[PDB]
Amino acid sequence: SGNYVLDLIYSLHKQINRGLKKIVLGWA
C-alpha cells in the first residue's frame, strides 16, 4: 500500500542502527 510510516521507519531504524553499530564498533 502507499503509506508514509514505512518510509519514516528508515529514520526509526537509523536510531537503532547507531546503537547497534556502536555495540559492534566498540566490542566484537
C-alpha positions as a printed Julia matrix, in Angstrom:
28×3 Matrix{Float64}:
  0.0    0.0    0.0
  1.13   3.63  -0.47
  1.92   4.51   3.18
  4.34   7.11   4.61
  5.13   5.46   8.0
  7.11   2.67   6.25
  9.21   5.41   4.59
  9.65   7.07   8.03
 10.67   3.75   9.7
 14.01   4.35   7.9
 14.7    7.19  10.4
 13.47   5.0   13.29
 15.94   2.28  12.2
 18.75   4.88  11.91
 18.45   5.35  15.69
 18.55   1.57  16.32
 21.47   1.34  13.84
 23.52   3.95  15.76
 23.36   1.82  18.95
 23.57  -1.5   17.02
 26.68  -0.25  15.14
 28.27   1.15  18.35
 28.0   -2.29  20.04
 29.92  -3.96  17.17
 32.15  -0.88  16.69
 33.16  -0.9   20.39
 33.17  -4.69  21.06
 33.26  -7.77  18.76
